[PDB]
C-alpha cells in the first residue's frame, strides 16, 4: 500500500512534466506560426506585377528574416534541456507505479527545412553588367620632342643674351605631371650673361617642336621633375590587379588561367523596367564575377571570400561570386554545392554536412508551399493539445486512486 500511494504520488509529479513538455512546444509553435502566417502575407503581397524587383527584394529580406527566426525558435527553445523542436525525439514517461504505465511524447523537428521552405524566394534576376575600371596616366606617343629649333640665336632672341654660345644642356627636357609642363637647363652663356644660365621652361606644340617664349627668365626645375623624351599625354589605364588578389581567387577555387586574367569592374545591375543601378566592385575572371572591395586612392584591391571548414576537416576558403537568384547575391561554390556565403561562413561540413543551399530560381507556387507547412504545423499543434489531455486525465486518476488508498 506504501508502494503504491508513494508510486502513484510521484507519477502524478512525472505527469505534470508531460504537461509543461506540451506547453513549452505549444508556445513556441504558437510563435513560429505567427512568422509563417507574416510569410504567408508577404507571398501574396509579391504577387503582384506591378512590384520592382527593389520591392521584391526588400519583400525577400523580410522573408528572410521571419525563416531565420523560425530556426531560432526551433534550435533554442527547451524544457530542463530538451531542445522540443529540435529533433524527431518520442519521449516516455511513466505515469503509473509500475514499469511500462507511459505516455510516449512525440516531439518532431521543426524547422525551415523540414516545412520545406529554406529555398522560399519570390526576387527575380536583374540583367548584368559591368563597366572597365580605369585610371588616368601619363604616356606617349611617337611624337618625339624636337628641340632642335631652340638654338643659339632662338634662346638669345627669348632671353636677351648676347656673350657666349648658349644651348639646351645635353638637349634634354624635364616634365611634369602636376601641371603638364615641361622645363629645360640652359647653359654657355659668358660674361654678364652668364647669369642666365639655369632652368627655363618651355612650350610643346601638338608636335615635337619645343620653344622658349619672349621675356624668357631662368625658374627653379620643379621638384619632381622627370626627363622625358616624347610628348606626355594622359590615357586611361585598366586599374592592376595584384598578385595576392589573384591568388585569394585561386586559393578560393577559381580557375587559374581564369583568375590570372582576371579584370577590376564596377557592377550595374537593370530591372525589368529599364531602370539601371551602380554596383559594387568586382574580379570578372572568366565570365564569373566575384565580389572585391577597391581603394580608389590607392588601388588596392581585396577579393571578397569565405572561411569554413571542409568535409575532410581541414580549413579553406572559397571566392564570393555574385549569383544567386537576383544576380547581385555573394554566393560560393563547394564541393558540389552552391550556398549563399553569409550562410557558409564559419561552417563546419565535416560535423554539418547538411547546409541549405542557396535559392537558385524564383519560388513556384509558394502559397501551396507555405500552406503545406502551416497544416504541419497545426498537425503537431493538435497532437500535443491532445497528449496533454491524457496527461491530465492520468493526474485526476492518480489523484483517487491516492484519495482511496489513504
Known amino acids: 500500500s506504501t508502494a503504491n500511494i508513494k508510486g502513484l504520488t510521484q507519477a502524478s509529479r512525472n505527469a505534470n512534466d508531460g504537461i509543461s513538455i506540451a506547453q513549452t512546444t505549444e508556445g513556441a509553435l504558437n510563435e513560429?506560426?505567427?512568422?509563417?502566417?507574416?510569410?504567408?502575407?508577404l507571398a501574396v503581397q509579391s504577387?503582384?506585377?506591378?512590384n520592382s524587383q527593389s520591392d521584391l527584394d526588400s519583400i525577400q529580406a523580410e522573408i528572410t528574416q521571419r525563416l531565420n527566426e523560425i530556426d531560432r525558435v526551433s534550435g533554442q527553445t527547451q524544457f530542463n534541456g530538451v531542445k522540443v523542436l529540435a529533433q524527431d525525439n518520442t519521449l516516455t514517461i511513466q505515469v503509473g507505479a509500475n514499469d511500462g504505465e507511459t505516455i510516449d511524447i512525440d516531439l518532431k523537428q521543426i524547422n525551415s527545412q523540414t516545412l520545406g521552405l529554406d529555398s522560399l524566394n519570390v526576387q527575380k534576376a536583374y540583367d548584368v553588367k559591368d563597366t572597365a575600371v580605369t585610371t588616368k596616366v601619363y604616356?606617349?606617343?611617337?611624337?618625339?620632342?624636337?628641340?632642335?629649333?631652340?638654338?643659339?640665336?632662338?634662346?638669345?632672341?627669348?632671353?636677351?643674351?648676347?656673350?657666349?654660345?648658349?644651348?639646351?644642356?645635353?638637349?634634354?627636357?624635364?616634365?611634369?605631371?602636376?601641371?603638364?609642363?615641361?622645363?629645360?637647363?640652359?647653359?654657355?652663356?659668358?660674361?654678364?650673361?652668364?647669369?642666365?644660365?639655369?632652368?627655363?621652361?618651355?612650350?610643346?606644340?601638338?608636335?615635337?617642336?619645343?620653344?622658349?617664349?619672349?621675356?624668357?627668365?631662368?625658374?627653379?626645375?620643379?621638384?619632381?621633375?622627370?626627363?622625358?623624351?616624347?610628348?606626355?599625354?594622359?590615357?586611361?589605364?585598366?586599374?592592376?590587379?595584384?598578385?595576392?588578389a589573384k591568388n585569394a581567387l585561386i586559393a578560393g577555387g577559381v580557375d587559374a588561367t581564369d583568375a590570372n586574367g582576371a579584370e577590376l569592374v564596377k557592377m550595374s545591375y537593370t530591372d525589368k523596367n529599364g531602370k539601371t543601378i551602380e554596383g559594387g566592385y568586382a574580379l570578372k575572371a572568366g565570365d564569373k564575377y566575384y565580389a572585391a572591395d577597391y581603394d580608389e586612392a590607392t588601388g588596392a584591391i581585396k577579393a571578397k571570400t569565405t572561411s569554413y571548414t571542409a568535409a575532410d576537416g581541414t580549413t579553406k576558403t572559397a571566392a564570393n561570386q555574385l549569383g544567386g537568384v537576383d544576380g547581385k547575391t555573394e554566393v560560393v561554390t563547394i564541393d558540389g554545392k552552391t550556398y549563399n556565403a553569409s550562410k557558409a561562413a564559419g561552417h563546419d561540413f565535416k560535423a554539418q554536412p547538411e547546409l541549405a543551399e542557396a535559392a537558385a530560381k524564383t519560388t513556384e507556387n509558394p502559397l501551396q508551399k507555405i500552406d503545406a507547412a502551416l497544416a504541419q504545423v497545426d498537425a503537431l499543434r493538435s497532437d500535443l493539445g491532445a497528449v496533454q489531455n491524457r496527461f491530465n486525465s492520468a493526474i485526476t486518476n492518480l489523484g483517487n486512486t491516492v484519495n482511496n488508498l489513504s
Open 139 to 244: 604616356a606617349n606617343n611617337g611624337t618625339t620632342l624636337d628641340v632642335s629649333g631652340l638654338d643659339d640665336a632662338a634662346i638669345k632672341a627669348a632671353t636677351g643674351g648676347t656673350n657666349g654660345t648658349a644651348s639646351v644642356t645635353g638637349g634634354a627636357v624635364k616634365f611634369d605631371a602636376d601641371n603638364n609642363k615641361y622645363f629645360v637647363t640652359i647653359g654657355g652663356f659668358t660674361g654678364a650673361d652668364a647669369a642666365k644660365n639655369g632652368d627655363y621652361e618651355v612650350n610643346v606644340a601638338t608636335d615635337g617642336t619645343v620653344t622658349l617664349a619672349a621675356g624668357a627668365t631662368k625658374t627653379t626645375m620643379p621638384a619632381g621633375a622627370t626627363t622625358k623624351t616624347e610628348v606626355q599625354e594622359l590615357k586611361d589605364t585598366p586599374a592592376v590587379v595584384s598578385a595576392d
Open 32 to 41: 513560429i506560426n505567427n512568422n509563417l502566417q507574416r510569410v504567408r502575407e
Open 47 to 50: 504577387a503582384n506585377s506591378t
